[PDB]
Paper text:
Hair cells have a characteristic morphology and harbor actin-filled stereocilia ‘staircases’ in which the stereocilia are coupled by protocadherin 15 (PCDH15) molecules from one stereocilium linked with cadherin 23 (CDH23) molecules from an adjacent stereocilium. Upon movement of the stereocilia induced by fluctuations of the surrounding fluid, the PCDH15-CDH23 ‘tip links’ trigger the opening of a mechano-electrical transduction (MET) ion channel at the stereocilia tips. PCDH15 belongs to the cadherin superfamily and consists of 11 extracellular cadherin (EC) domains, an extracellular linker (EL) domain, a single transmembrane (TM) helix and a cytoplasmic domain. Here we demonstrate that PCDH15 forms a robust complex with LHFPL5 and that the assembly is composed of 2 copies of each protein, thus providing concrete evidence that the composition of PCDH15 in the tip link is a dimer.
Residue numbers in the entry: 1144 to 1387
Write the structure that this text describes.
Amino acid sequence: DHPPVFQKKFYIGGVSEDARMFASVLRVKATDRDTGNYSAMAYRLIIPPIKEGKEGFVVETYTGLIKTAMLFHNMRRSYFKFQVIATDDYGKGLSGKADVLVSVVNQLDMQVIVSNVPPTLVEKKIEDLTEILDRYVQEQIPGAKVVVESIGARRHGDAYSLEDYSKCDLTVYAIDPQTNRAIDRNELFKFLDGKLLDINKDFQPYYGEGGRILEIRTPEAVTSIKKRGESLGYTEGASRLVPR
Ligand SMILES: *[C@H]1O[C@H](CO)[C@@H](O)[C@H](O)[C@@H]1O
């Protein structure tokens, strides 16, 4: 008689500082090893105490969806290590467990993947596309996890203020469980841009003929942060100050 087994031993996710209350973070799932059943699994989180009556995150008991339960203003680099449990038979059966890491980021952690297909196409296939991106990042940083911040129209024009809904801006970041924070955005750029032709070939079954990533770019918000004189420090190979 065997306990529920989570599909991953370790779920990694992220939230941005501006995430709304009860925003989706990630979904967990456990099944019975012998039958594959999962229709009666009750999911619960085990989170350490948080100040001020905040609860951090909740999980939908019967769907496994983890959602935010507090705001994350100014909390870039905060991290939440907790557990999720699954108990079969609506709580009356055996239990399994997995670890969870959620890291807080902002636009200083992100890169924009620009594609020549509409955002609805990218969104529809996002699970398969994220898994491909994971593979390339994990070759450089084992165990890292790519997270999708947003999928939208391609931004362009002055200050990237115009929207082209026939193309797509896919804003991503990656969380490193060794550091409990995001991978440096310029390292993330190097990982993706350096393999852009290989990633494009892997994306072909999903983007269709003629579809490809056009470029990787840094969010416009990063330029606004430097103009305000924030997060500026030393970086390697340059005398110009770049936001951290
Ligand atoms: C809730 O929705 C987010 C995206 O909005 C997913 O990334 C997550 O896995 C869950 O399905």
